Amino acid sequence: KRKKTSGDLDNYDVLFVGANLGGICSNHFDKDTHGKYKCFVSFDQPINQIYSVRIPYEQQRVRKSEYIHFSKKSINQFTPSEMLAVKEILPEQNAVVLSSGRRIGYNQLVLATGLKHDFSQIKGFYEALEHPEHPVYANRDPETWRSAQHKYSKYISNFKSGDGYFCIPEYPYAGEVECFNFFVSDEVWKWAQHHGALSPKHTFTIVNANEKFVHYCDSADAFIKERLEKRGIRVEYNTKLLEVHQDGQKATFINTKTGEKSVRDYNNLYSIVPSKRQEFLDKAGLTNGNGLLNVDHQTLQHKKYKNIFGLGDAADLPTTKTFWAGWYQIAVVRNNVKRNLQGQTLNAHYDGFSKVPLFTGHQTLTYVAHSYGGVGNWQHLKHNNGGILAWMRYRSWAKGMAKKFQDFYNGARLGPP
Ligand SMILES: NC(=O)c1ccc[n+]([C@@H]2O[C@H](COP(=O)([O-])OP(=O)(O)OC[C@H]3O[C@@H](n4cnc5c(N)ncnc54)[C@H](O)[C@@H]3O)[C@@H](O)[C@H]2O)c1
Numbered sequence: 001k002r003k004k005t006s007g008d009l010d011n012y013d014v015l016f017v018g019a020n021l022g023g024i025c026s027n028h029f030d031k032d033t034h035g036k037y038k039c040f041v042s043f044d045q046p047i048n049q050i051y052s053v054r055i056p057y058e059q060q061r062v063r064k065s066e067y068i069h070f071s072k073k074s075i076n077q078f079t080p081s082e083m084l085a086v087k088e089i090l091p092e093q094n095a096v097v098l099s100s101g102r103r104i105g106y107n108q109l110v111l112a113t114g115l116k117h118d119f120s121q122i123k124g125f126y127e128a129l130e131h132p133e134h135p136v137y138a139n140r141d142p143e144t145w146r147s148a149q150h151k152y153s154k155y156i157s158n159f160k161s162g163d164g165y166f167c168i169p170e171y172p173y174a175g176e177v178e179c180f181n182f183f184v185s186d187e188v189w190k191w192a193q194h195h196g197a198l199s200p201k202h203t204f205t206i207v208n209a210n211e212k213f214v215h216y217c218d219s220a221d222a223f224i225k226e227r228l229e230k231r232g233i234r235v236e237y238n239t240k241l242l243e244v245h246q247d248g249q250k251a252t253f254i255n256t257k258t259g260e261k262s263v264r265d266y267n268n269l270y271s272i273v274p275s276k277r278q279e280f281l282d283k284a285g286l287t288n289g290n291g292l293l294n295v296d297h298q299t300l301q302h303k304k305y306k307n308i309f310g311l312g313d314a315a316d317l318p319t320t321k322t323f324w325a326g327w328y329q330i331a332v333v334r335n336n337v338k339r340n341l342q343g344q345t346l347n348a349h350y351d352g353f354s355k356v357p358l359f360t361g362h363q364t365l366t367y368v369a370h371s372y373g374g375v376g377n378w379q380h381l382k383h384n385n386g387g388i389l390a391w392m393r394y395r396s397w398a399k400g401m402a403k404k405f406q407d408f409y410n411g412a413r414l415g416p417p
Contacts, residue, residue, distance in 0.1 A: 005038040007080035011105030012040045018112025019043035021312045023074030025330040044085040056398035066402035074409040089284045091305045111310040115174045118276035123243040139273045161199040162267025167241040168208040169274035177356045209240030217370045292316035298349040325354035327415045364390040
């Protein structure tokens with residue numbers, strides 16, 4: 001009946017750059033328009049690691065099959081895709097050049113290029129995270145690990161002794177609140193001190209380069225800091241991890257405020273992988289400052305270039321870059337983009353809603369739900385101190401969310417509402 005559109009073409013009437021949230025949109029853009037347009041997708045990496053369940057992963061509450069998903073699956077069968085990165089974007093020409101060189105034209109462009117992980121900002125990090133024994137752990141799995149490597153789970157369990165550092169890189173970085181495992185670790189290391197598994201000649205400090213944990217929600221940052229103390233955890237601000245020596249287990253830090261670097265023995269290091277701005281977005285004059293797209297806060301349309309959009313993490317938005325945010329930014333992009341193909345006005349506005357669980361304990365969580373102005377809704381920091389209510393919501397996310405990300409990329413389950 002309906003036939004797959006061509007990938008061997010010279011221009012399309014929509015072009016999506018990304019598969020994770022750029023693909024869920026296309027599958028939504030079709031069901032919203034009934035296939036009246038031919039849309040192309042061009043991602044860069046083959047696998048989509050589901051970082052929304054990254055802590056239930058490290059607890060082995062989610063199997064590796066439910067955490068690793070191919071990028072093709074997000075895209076529907078009809079829409080053609082190719083795993084080639086766009087070399088440059090010519091917005092004045094309405095065109096997009098890929099790595100191979102095949103110039104592609106467009107009518108509307110949707111950018112979901114996220115924040116690109118740059119393991120090389122931290123020298124020697126990747127080669128220590130790939131080692132199946134070294135105590136260097138990170139926010140994501142390398143692609144050379146096979147189905148039988150479960151090093152990720154050993155971070156909390158194998159912390160018998162020594163100095164442990166949890167390092168947060170410089171904003172903008174991916175995985176703000178969803179990759180903070182320093183409250184479940186404390187609980188599990190509070191037991192290990194009680195029966196002797198974890199020595200008392202050990203120190204754990206949070207090396208945060210940024211001044212605050214959550215830039216766009218004051219209430220969450222205040223709660224995190226207040227709760228970090230009540231536990232007894234120590235934080236070091238304005239310090240960022242700069243190098244890792246895998247032989248002697250030395251970690252070179254630098255306090256950007258004073259520019260004064262230190263070297264410290266580690267025996268358990270975790271880092272939230274550091275990102276890096278892509279230059280083809282700055283040669284094209286789209287990004288603003290930090291490297292994020294200069295888009296409207298309400299409609300998500302680019303300030304200049306009325307026909308370019310942007311969503312997800314690539315977009316410069318005053319909210320927490322979560323997934324449930326993007327669930328609301330594809331509903332908006334797929335509307336306006338279609339209103340712009342019909343000439344009509346852009347009637348869909350983004351409220352700034354973003355919802356990410358924060359795990360306060362081994363089996364408890366609280367939701368960070370907040371709109372554009374940092375203002376939280378009825379769930380913001382509820383049942384934060386644990387209890388039967390937070391216990392259940394933990395199971396509903398750990399045992400029941402990874403089973404859903406298959407549908408999202410299928411199409412069988414759409415957004416929350
Ligand atoms: N906790 C973490 O460390 C982490 C890291 C990445 C993503 N995430 C989650 O994923 C959610 C969605 O992320 P996103 O959609 O904003 O970005 P993303 O991290 O999912 O990646 C964006 C997609 O665009 C592709 N891409 C990047 N550069 C490209 C280029 N030059 N050309 C073509 N394709 C390119 C990528 O391969 C990818 O398919 C985020 O809200 C976040 O919750 C978390």
